[PDB]
C-alpha cells in the first residue's frame, strides 16, 4: 500500500510491520503445544474436528523462567506465591471414589481391637478421625504441597499410636525435607520411644532439642536389625531429585516410590517388630502396638497402590507446570493431621481416580497466563528503568513503577508491603536486559529525539549573547531572523546545572562585564516582527 510519512514515522511504522509477533498455526502446533508427558500417557486419548489452514496465526507466550530469583531472600513474596499455587493445586486434585464405608471399617477395627468397656485402654483413640473428608483432605494436601513446594507441619497427639504408625508410611512416601524440622523431629522421637526401642529393649531415648541429628539417624546406628535399619536408611536418605525436563525444573520422586516397593520394606520392618517381645514393658502395651500394626499389615496392598496413585497424579499434574518448582522452606506452613493420614491409609480401595484432561488444561492455562504476565510485566519495568537511567532522570524515585509491577501481579497486597523491597527488586531489575521491541523503539527515539526537540516552535535550544553587531540570516520561511544553528565560537553555560546548584556568580560576572556567552537549555521566546524593536536593541534588555 502507498503511504506518506516523515522518516521518523516511517521508522516506527516499518519496525511495527517487520517485527510483529504472529506464527502460522496448524494441528501439529496444537499437539506440540500440549506437554510431552500427557501425549505420551497412554491413558489419555485425544482427537479433534478441524483442519486449520495456512492462513491461520497464533501468538506465543513468554514462558521464560524467573529472571528475578524470588527463591532467594524475598521469602514473604515467595510465601504468597507458594500459597497461591498451593490453593490452586487443591482445586484440581481429584476427589476419591468408591471409598470404604466408615462403619464397615470401624466395626472391623473394633473387633480386631477387642475394646473392653470397663477397663481403660489406649486403643479407643485409634478410632479418632476415621471419617471421609479427611482422606480427601490428606490426599489433596500432600500433592498440592509437593507441587507448590509448600512446607507443612504435623499436628497430632502422643496417645494415638495409630498416628505414629501411619507416620511411617507418610515419612516414606513423602521426603523429610518436605516438612519443617521440629515437627517431624517430634514425630520421629515419639515413634522411636514408643514403637521401636521398646521393641528391642533399648533405652527410651535421650534426645537433645537442637541436636543436629534427627532421631532416625542415630537410631540407624544403634539397633541391630537389617530390615528396620534399611527402612530408616531409606527414610533419612529420601529426598527429591532435581531434574530439568522440557524447560522446567522438577522435583521428582525416587522411582522406587513411583512403584510401590518401599511399602514392602515397611512391612518387613513392622513384622520384625511384631515378632519382638517387649521385655521392658507389660503385656498390654505390646498388645496395643501389635494390634495397631496388624491394622496396617492387613492394608498392605491398598497402601502399595495408594502410593503408586499419589506418585502418578503428582507427576501428571507436574507435567502441567511452567515455572521452575524450586524447593525452599516457606515461612508459613500447612497443617497436616495424621488422623487424616490414618483415614486415607485405612479407607481406600479398588478405585483409580485420574485427573480429567479438562482439569489438566485448566491448571496449565492458569500457570501459563500467570507466567507470561510475570515475564511481560518484568519487561515493562526493566524498559522504563533503563530508559530513566539513560535519560539521566535523577530526581525520579523508582517506587511507583514497582507498585505498578506488583499490582499487575494480581496476588500481592501492596498496602502492606515495605518500601525497601521495591528498591531491592529494582536493583535486580536494572541488571536484566531489555527485550528487543522496547529496546529498538527506545534506540529509535534516542537517535531522533534531538530532531524532534528542534521542532515545536514554542521553546528554543538556547540564546547567544555577543556584544557585537552581527548579521541576520536570510531564511525563507521567515525572512530575516536572529537565528543560530551551530553554536560554535562563543562558549556556553548549561541551565540545569545552574538551577540545581544556584551559582549565579559566573553568569553575573559575565553579564556585568558584558562578556560574550551562550545559554543552553529549552527556553521560550516571542516572535517580534518590528524593525523599530530591532534598531533599538531590545533583545539585550531581557
Amino acid at each position: 500500500y502507498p503511504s506518506i510519512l516523515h522518516p521518523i514515522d516511517h521508522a516506527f511504522n516499518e519496525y511495527f510491520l517487520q517485527h510483529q509477533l504472529v506464527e502460522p498455526l496448524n494441528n501439529d502446533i496444537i499437539f506440540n503445544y500440549i506437554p510431552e508427558r500427557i501425549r505420551n500417557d497412554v491413558n489419555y486419548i485425544l482427537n479433534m474436528d478441524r483442519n486449520l489452514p495456512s492462513t491461520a496465526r497464533y501468538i506465543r507466550p513468554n514462558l521464560l523462567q524467573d529472571r528475578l530469583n524470588l527463591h532467594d531472600n524475598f521469602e514473604s513474596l515467595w510465601d504468597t506465591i507458594t500459597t497461591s499455587n498451593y490453593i490452586l493445586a487443591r482445586s484440581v486434585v481429584p476427589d476419591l471414589k468408591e471409598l470404604v464405608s466408615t462403619e464397615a471399617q470401624i466395626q472391623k477395627m473394633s473387633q480386631d481391637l477387642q475394646l473392653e468397656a470397663l477397663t481403660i485402654q489406649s486403643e479407643t483413640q485409634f478410632l479418632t478421625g476415621i471419617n471421609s473428608q479427611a482422606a480427601n483432605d490428606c490426599f489433596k494436601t500432600l500433592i498440592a504441597a509437593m507441587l507448590s513446594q509448600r512446607t507443612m507441619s504435623l499436628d497430632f497427639v502422643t496417645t494415638n499410636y495409630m498416628s505414629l504408625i501411619s507416620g511411617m508410611w507418610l515419612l516414606t512416601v513423602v521426603p523429610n525435607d518436605m516438612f519443617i524440622r521440629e515437627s517431624l523431629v517430634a514425630c520421629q522421637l515419639a515413634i522411636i520411644n514408643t514403637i521401636i526401642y521398646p521393641a528391642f529393649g533399648m533405652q527410651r531415648m535421650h534426645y537433645r532439642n537442637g541436636d543436629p541429628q534427627t532421631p532416625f539417624q542415630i537410631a540407624e546406628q544403634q539397633i541391630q536389625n537389617f530390615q528396620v535399619a534399611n527402612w530408616l536408611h531409606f527414610v533419612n536418605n529420601n529426598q527429591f531429585r532435581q531434574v530439568v525436563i522440557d524447560g522446567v525444573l522438577n522435583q521428582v520422586l525416587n522411582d522406587n516410590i513411583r512403584n510401590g516397593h518401599v511399602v514392602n520394606q515397611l512391612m518387613e520392618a513392622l513384622m520384625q517388630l511384631s515378632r519382638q517381645q517387649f521385655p521392658t514393658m507389660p503385656v498390654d502395651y505390646k498388645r496395643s502396638i501389635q494390634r495397631g500394626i496388624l491394622l496396617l499389615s492387613n492394608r498392605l496392598g491398598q497402601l502399595v497402590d495408594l502410593t503408586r496413585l499419589l506418585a502418578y497424579n503428582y507427576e501428571t499434574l507436574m507435567a502441567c507446570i511452567t515455572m521452575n518448582m524450586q524447593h525452599v522452606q516457606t515461612l508459613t506452613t500447612e497443617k497436616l493431621q495424621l488422623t487424616s493420614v490414618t483415614s486415607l491409609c485405612m479407607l481406600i480401595g479398588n478405585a483409580t481416580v485420574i485427573p480429567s484432561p479438562q482439569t489438566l488444561f485448566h491448571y496449565y492455562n492458569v500457570n501459563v497466563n500467570f507466567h507470561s504476565n510475570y515475564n511481560e510485566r518484568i519487561n515493562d519495568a526493566v524498559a522504563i528503568i533503563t530508559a530513566a537511567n539513560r535519560l539521566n532522570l535523577y530526581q525520579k524515585k523508582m517506587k511507583s513503577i514497582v507498585e505498578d509491577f506488583l499490582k499487575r501481579l494480581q496476588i500481592f497486597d501492596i498496602s502492606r508491603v515495605p518500601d525497601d523491597q521495591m528498591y531491592r527488586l529494582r536493583d535486580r531489575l536494572r541488571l536484566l536486559p531489555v527485550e528487543i521491541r522496547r529496546l529498538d523503539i527506545f534506540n529509535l527515539i534516542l537517535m531522533n529525539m534531538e530532531q524532534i526537540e528542534r521542532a515545536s516552535d514554542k521553546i528554543a535550544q538556547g540564546v547567544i549573547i555577543a556584544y557585537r553587531d552581527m548579521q541576520l540570516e536570510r531564511d525563507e520561511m521567515y525572512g530575516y531572523v536572529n537565528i543560530a544553528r551551530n553554536l560554535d565560537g562563543f562558549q556556553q553555560i548549561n541551565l540545569e546545572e545552574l538551577m540545581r546548584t544556584g551559582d549565579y556568580a559566573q553568569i553575573t560576572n559575565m553579564l556585568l562585564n558584558n562578556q560574550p556567552v551562550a545559554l543552553v537549555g529549552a527556553l521560550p521566546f516571542i516572535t517580534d516582527s518590528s524593525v523599530i524593536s530591532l534598531v533599538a536593541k531590545l533583545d539585550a534588555t531581557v
Binding site: 466408615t102 462403619e103 470401624i106 466395626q107 473394633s110 475394646l115 473392653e116 468397656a117 478410632l127
Partner: protein
C-alpha cells in the same frame, strides 16, 4: 456428644450400637475416676 461420624451414630446395625454403648461406658468410667480424684 460423641466424636464419631454421623453414619455410625445412625447405623441400625448391631455392631455400631454395641460400639457406641462401649464408648459411652469408657467415657463414664473416665469421668468417675476424675470426679473421685477431684474428691
Amino acid at each position: 456428644e460423641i466424636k464419631i461420624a454421623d453414619e455410625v451414630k445412625k447405623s441400625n446395625k448391631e455392631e455400631s450400637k454395641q460400639l457406641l454403648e462401649v464408648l459411652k461406658t469408657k467415657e463414664e468410667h473416665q469421668k468417675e475416676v476424675q470426679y473421685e480424684i477431684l474428691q
